[PDB]
Design an enzyme around this catalytic site. Structure first.
Site, PDB file in Angstrom:
ATOM      1  N   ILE A  17       0.949  -1.186  -0.113  1.00 53.34           N
ATOM      2  CA  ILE A  17      -0.061   0.122   0.085  1.00 53.34           C
ATOM      3  C   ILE A  17       0.861   1.313   0.010  1.00 53.34           C
ATOM      4  O   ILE A  17       1.780   1.215   0.797  1.00 53.34           O
ATOM      5  CB  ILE A  17      -1.065   0.023   1.094  1.00 53.34           C
ATOM      6  CG1 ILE A  17      -1.675  -1.206   1.445  1.00 53.34           C
ATOM      7  CG2 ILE A  17      -1.899   1.234   1.083  1.00 53.34           C
ATOM      8  CD1 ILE A  17      -0.846  -2.332   2.396  1.00 53.34           C
ATOM      9  N   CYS A  18       0.562   2.087  -0.652  1.00 55.93           N
ATOM     10  CA  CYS A  18       1.234   3.365  -0.911  1.00 55.93           C
ATOM     11  C   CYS A  18       0.768   4.342   0.102  1.00 55.93           C
ATOM     12  O   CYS A  18      -0.279   5.152  -0.017  1.00 55.93           O
ATOM     13  CB  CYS A  18       1.176   4.178  -2.262  1.00 55.93           C
ATOM     14  SG  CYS A  18       1.744   3.164  -3.506  1.00 55.93           S
ATOM     15  N   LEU A  19       1.256   4.115   1.556  1.00 56.02           N
ATOM     16  CA  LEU A  19       0.601   4.974   2.695  1.00 56.02           C
ATOM     17  C   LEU A  19       1.658   5.661   2.977  1.00 56.02           C
ATOM     18  O   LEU A  19       2.795   5.356   3.545  1.00 56.02           O
ATOM     19  CB  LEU A  19       0.082   4.031   3.608  1.00 56.02           C
ATOM     20  CG  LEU A  19      -0.301   4.548   4.993  1.00 56.02           C
ATOM     21  CD1 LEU A  19      -1.705   5.263   4.523  1.00 56.02           C
ATOM     22  CD2 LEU A  19      -0.710   3.334   5.736  1.00 56.02           C
ATOM     23  N   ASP A  30      -3.300   8.519  -5.355  1.00 54.18           N
ATOM     24  CA  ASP A  30      -1.992   7.978  -5.548  1.00 54.18           C
ATOM     25  C   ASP A  30      -2.233   6.388  -6.012  1.00 54.18           C
ATOM     26  O   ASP A  30      -2.283   5.713  -5.089  1.00 54.18           O
ATOM     27  CB  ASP A  30      -0.964   8.075  -4.688  1.00 54.18           C
ATOM     28  CG  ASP A  30       0.117   7.542  -4.866  1.00 54.18           C
ATOM     29  OD1 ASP A  30       0.644   7.373  -5.864  1.00 54.18           O
ATOM     30  OD2 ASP A  30       0.882   7.121  -3.752  1.00 54.18           O
ATOM     31  N   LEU A  85      -1.342   2.471  -7.780  1.00 54.42           N
ATOM     32  CA  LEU A  85      -0.355   1.714  -8.091  1.00 54.42           C
ATOM     33  C   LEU A  85      -0.819   0.869  -9.225  1.00 54.42           C
ATOM     34  O   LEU A  85       0.089   0.348 -10.034  1.00 54.42           O
ATOM     35  CB  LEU A  85       0.227   0.995  -6.921  1.00 54.42           C
ATOM     36  CG  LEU A  85       1.627   0.132  -7.358  1.00 54.42           C
ATOM     37  CD1 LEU A  85       2.453   0.086  -5.766  1.00 54.42           C
ATOM     38  CD2 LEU A  85       1.442  -1.086  -7.694  1.00 54.42           C
TER      39      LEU A  85
END
Ligand SMILES: [Zn+2]
Ligand SMILES: [Zn+2]
Ligand SMILES: [Zn+2]
Lengths: 147, 99, 87, 94, 93, 110, 83, 99, 80, 109, 95
Positions: A84-86, A117, A119
């Site tokens: 996860i882009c966190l 954002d 992915l």
DNA sequence: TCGGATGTATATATCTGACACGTGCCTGGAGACTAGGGAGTAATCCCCTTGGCGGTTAAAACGCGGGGGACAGCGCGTACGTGCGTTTAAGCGGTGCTAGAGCTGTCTACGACCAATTGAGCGGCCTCGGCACCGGGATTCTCGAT
DNA sequence: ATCGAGAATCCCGGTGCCGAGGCCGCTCAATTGGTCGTAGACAGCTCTAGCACCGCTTAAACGCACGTACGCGCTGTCCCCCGCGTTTTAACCGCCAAGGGGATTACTCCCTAGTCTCCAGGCACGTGTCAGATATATACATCCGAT
């Protein structure tokens, strides 16, 4: 000392059960973690028993841990590798947080998907165009990998 | 064959040694002679307190050490590791010591 | 008996929770920054211009933010006091 | 009966959660406040401050934490030892 | 003989309050004398130019306060003003 | 403060207040020296001395020495940031320098 | 009692040690003559001022305070020798 | 084909033009807005004399012009003709504006 | 807000030309805005300190001149 | 020379000696101001002013302009050596800058 | 009400000008710069002489103090010429 | 990766002189009192700073084609670092001499202070000439064509 | 090499405007004269520290050989600033209006300089003792060649 912090975290999570989610080690190795979450209704991901694999750096809680989901989940950010882009898990991690904090935070991020954002292209695109079919596709994938 | 350290290792060892300590690095008597020689050209028959000569040496060594730091940055800027006369001249020009 | 040990133990806590002016159960405690002193919000909002009336340390901040942690310890104490009286 | 002291332990369970470090999650070892009135242990702080060359960020709310900015509170240190005393009498008398 | 003035006795007092055990070498005491004298000159000198710009003829406290705000860098400034203000308030009353 | 004691004590400081008053009078800084300036100036000086001495003491304890020497003063002043900017131009006698090597010169790590 | 070529008394190894304290790892052969010239200019400026203070007091001995005042007015304030 | 000067000739023409004249080079109104914005963060409700804004612009332009001269010397030292961010940073470090 | 962007790309280039610069990398412009802002903060900070001390509400030319002087940027032509 | 006139003309200068005397007294420079100091100081100030004005007048004649402007003051200060060393830090408002192109940047055959 | 008067070195600089270049005027902005320059140099010399008289525990700024301040403040050739002019003026004044 | 050789951190007895503390005293700081002038406060006035049209047009923003400079890679040959045996003079300790810094006493010539006064310098008005501007023309660098 | 077209720059003459240089009236700061306390010049005396010298020990400077890391030059590539034409945004200017607050004047009082008396805060001086420098002897970390 991250080991001692996670021991008290397990003890705190023991003396205080969180809302419909559990955690544990990967065996007898401490620097990895296996957890499970159950689907919230304020989200397209209900009913999915979701496994979480977590790897910690050596200076927990100074540098941020990293996570991965073993499910191909119809999420605008969570890819097939489950990453996860966190920002609060890579770049905005404050040393006051704990594991239960991020767990409910990702539950909220699951509650409200973020297409800002991405992915994976197709999930986020269908998310940002149509909500009914996104809900339909999201629920279908969760039934396959959890029931 | 006898033991030989590679070129550059001993230089780094000396950097650590002299940055760790505080003792003066110019020999006392040759510096004192230099001070007296310069002073005679301004006024003959001068005497110096011993503490006056020491104050001059402390200031001079501090100035040169600070100058060599700036010189090193100029050499690295040109993708070199060896300081050269043109490095000192550039540092002094930008500092404003020679316009 | 009758939890007399608890009453002695409890009272030892509240002797540590006294306003340096009000000298009573301090309500909405506030520290104005720059010193260790905490008071009741009523008795210092006037003296912000002259600073701390004990340290003489000047006031550092214009507003008077109420410390939540010191808020929590008071309301919990009252509930603890009420329960320990068995009412 | 219901052993209503569980509510008392519920009260004492609330005690540490206000009187616990938010960084190293131990009992407050040596309390240190900030401008934002957030309390820490001054070992987890100096372990947080020395690795940054410049102003740091408060772990909870705000920005601009500095070694000078913090001050030795010593308002909760005596509270901490009181809390252990509060717990200690419980097992003796219950 | 002749009599000299110095901050030796006072610097040692301040030391024993912040570090009750560590002494201080003689050469280090000389450096502290020079430091105190230097800062005194800066603050006093800046206060004098303020009085002259504003056509006053008196170095009051607030003149010293504005000089301290000018000389010392940011974070040091906020602390020295507070310390000085506290001292004057305690002295007056 | 009602006390009729030495002005140093009546202000709570340690630095002399009478001496600072004289130095401000005889020093030709201005014609009139208000009665508030010496206390304020003595307080500021005392605060700065406490800062530097605390930092220097820490460094001397690190090197396992119980007696501050000029090297410890240099270390304390340069490692801090605001104190370094206040004493940017000053040169401490017997001070050495800060141990640092430029990163490009360190041997070729793999 | 005249003196000659005293600046050559500042030896190559001494200049080497100063560069090492400055963090310099490799030194070109031409640096040594450049450094001697730079060092001499610095001393002339300071000693000129120091002697000017000595003359004003009608003394014949340059004291430590004379040198400290000269360095201070050049913006090279020195701690440790009085004042 | 229409006429085109080679790259670099017009740049030299402009250098001669602007070094010959003395007029201010930043537009008046945008600079005035910047000054007022910075001042509001220190103290609200400030007013400025018109000559005060002019003094600030003269000082700022003189400072930047002097800085660009030092930057150019650093670029030429590295056998380049294009000034780059690393050139400005080196100049400011040696000047002592950022230690 | 965002008034730093008023120091436009051609304005910074003109200043570089007066300093004898012939060719300019694209990233210089953003770097120059940041360095300029730091300089202004320092001068204005000192100027307002003089203004407040005089109990005035208008920053005078003398305030700026005195602020520049104490930083070693003595300015001729606006009094003093 | 003995006379009862203005101290300026008696010293033979073009500057006030009374005004400089008052400025040295009411400036807190020292407690007492000797009777010989203001004459010396006025002479030195007049000499420095004469130097700068001579050079600046030359530079204005060079541009065929008969009236000095700030630009000519800047030229006369930077071109000289001692004057530029004395006013090294000073900035002359509206002064421009010396024409100077680095050699490497110039065109090449 | 009448505006308070502001002193300046305008007329004296103008007299010195007409001695060196008897035909070249000077514009107002150029006049402000020359005025500010005289003020700055006066401050440097006076402040240095004050610091210098305090080092020797004197209380008087004699003429000798101004001479040494000039020697300390000006470059080589300027110091030599300015000292000459100053000495000439003082001896013409006293005799 | 690996065992050598080498430099460095660490631990222990020991011995010296720099530091911390007690004492006599004396000179500077504290306390009480008086007087005078610098600064605070109130009121006013008119200077100049903010704010707003509306018209012009100089200047910024954008897009495009390309060519010259940034930069990486290779190679070659000289300059410089490392080690060692030899030679030089710095450092140290001890001794003798006196030049000059430093302090005290005495005495007077220099600067502060004050009241009368009178001319140099500042504020305001005004006018003419130096400089800005514009249009036309001469010439002079620049680039591409050979 | 060269020469020709194309822009750019310098020179010159005519016109117009507004600011610099000079004049005049008038307030107030510089000048004159006298008096008086004391800062400073000068002679004399003391004795601290600077200079010169000499012999001895050994640490550092020096000259030399050698091998190798790197400074410098050349080549090739691609990509990113420059020059330029077109359109769009907003600076600049001339003008008008309002009112805030900077500057000035009059008054009053309280805060600080100046004086005298008195006494304890701090400094030179002398003395004991332990913190740190030294010297020996180890363990241990690091560099480098050869695998
Ligand atoms: Zn307080
Ligand atoms: Zn209260
Ligand atoms: Zn903690």
């Amino acid at each position: 000392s991250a080991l001692k912090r996670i021991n008290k975290e397990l003890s705190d999570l023991a003396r205080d059960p969180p809302a419909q989610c559990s955690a544990g080690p990967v065996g007898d190795d401490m620097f990895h973690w296996q957890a499970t979450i159950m689907g919230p209704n304020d989200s397209p991901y209900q009913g999915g028993v979701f496994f979480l694999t977590i790897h910690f750096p050596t200076d927990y809680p100074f540098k941020p841990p990293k996570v991965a989901f073993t499910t191909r989940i119809y999420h605008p950010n969570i890819n097939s590798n489950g990453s996860i882009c966190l920002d609060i898990l890579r770049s905005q991690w404050s040393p006051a947080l704990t594991i239960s904090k991020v767990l409910l935070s990702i539950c909220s991020l699951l509650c409200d998907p973020n297409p800002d954002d991405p992915l994976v292209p197709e999930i986020a695109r269908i998310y940002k165009t149509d909500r009914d079919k996104y809900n339909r596709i999201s629920r279908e994938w969760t039934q396959k990998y959890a029931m | 064959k006898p033991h030989r350290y590679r070129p550059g290792t001993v230089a780094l060892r000396e950097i650590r040694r002299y940055q760790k300590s505080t003792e003066l690095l110019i020999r006392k008597l040759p510096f004192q002679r230099l001070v007296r020689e310069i002073a005679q050209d301004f006024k003959t028959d001068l005497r110096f307190q011993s503490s006056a000569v020491m104050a001059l040496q402390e200031a001079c060594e501090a100035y040169l050490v600070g100058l060599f730091e700036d010189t090193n940055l100029c050499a690295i800027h040109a993708k070199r590791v060896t300081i050269m006369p043109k490095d000192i001249q550039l540092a002094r020009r930008i500092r404003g010591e020679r316009a | 008996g009758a939890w007399a040990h608890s009453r002695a133990a409890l009272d030892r806590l509240e002797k540590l929770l006294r306003c340096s002016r009000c000298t009573n159960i301090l309500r909405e405690p506030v520290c104005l920054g720059g010193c260790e002193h905490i008071f009741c919000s009523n008795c210092v909002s006037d003296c912000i211009g002259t600073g701390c009336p004990v340290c003489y340390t000047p006031a550092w901040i214009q507003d008077l933010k109420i410390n939540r942690q010191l808020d929590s310890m008071i309301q919990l104490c009252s509930k603890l006091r009420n329960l320990l009286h068995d009412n | 009966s219901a052993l209503r002291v569980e509510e008392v332990q519920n009260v004492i369970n609330a005690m540490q959660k206000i009187l616990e470090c938010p960084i190293c999650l131990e009992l407050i070892k040596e309390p240190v406040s900030t401008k934002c009135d957030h309390i820490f242990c001054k070992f987890c702080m100096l372990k947080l401050l020395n690795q940054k060359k410049g102003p740091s960020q408060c772990p909870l709310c705000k920005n601009d934490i500095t070694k000078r900015s913090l001050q030795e509170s010593t308002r909760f240190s005596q509270l901490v030892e009181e809390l252990l005393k509060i717990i200690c009498a419980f097992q003796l008398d219950t | 003989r002749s009599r000299k003035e110095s901050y030796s006795i006072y610097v040692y007092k301040v030391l024993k309050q912040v570090h009750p055990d560590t002494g201080i070498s003689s050469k280090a005491m000389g450096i502290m004398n020079s430091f105190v004298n230097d800062i005194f000159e800066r603050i006093a000198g800046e206060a004098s130019r303020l009085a002259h710009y504003n056509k006053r003829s008196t170095i009051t406290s607030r003149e010293i306060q504005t000089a301290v705000r000018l000389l010392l860098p940011g974070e040091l400034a906020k602390h020295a003003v507070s310390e000085g203000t506290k001292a004057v308030t305690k002295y007056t009353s | 403060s009602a006390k009729a004691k030495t002005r140093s004590s009546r202000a709570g400081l340690q630095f002399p207040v009478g001496r600072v008053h004289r130095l401000l009078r005889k020093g030709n800084y201005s014609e009139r020296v208000g009665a508030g300036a010496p206390v304020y100036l003595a307080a500021v000086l005392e605060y700065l001395t406490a800062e530097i001495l605390e930092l220097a003491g820490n460094a001397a304890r690190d090197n396992k020495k119980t007696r501050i020497i000029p090297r410890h003063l240099q270390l304390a002043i340069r490692n801090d940031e605001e104190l370094n900017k206040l004493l940017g131009r000053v040169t401490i006698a017997q001070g050495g320098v800060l141990p640092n090597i430029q990163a490009v010169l360190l041997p070729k790590k793999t | 009692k005249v003196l000659r070529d005293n600046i050559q008394g500042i030896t190559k190894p001494a200049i080497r040690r100063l560069a090492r304290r400055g963090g310099v790892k490799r030194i070109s052969g031409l640096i040594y003559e450049e450094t001697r010239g730079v060092l001499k200019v610095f001393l002339e400026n300071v000693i000129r001022d120091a002697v000017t203070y000595t003359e004003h007091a009608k003394r014949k001995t340059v004291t430590a305070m004379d040198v400290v005042y000269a360095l201070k007015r050049q913006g090279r304030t020195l701690y440790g020798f009085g004042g």
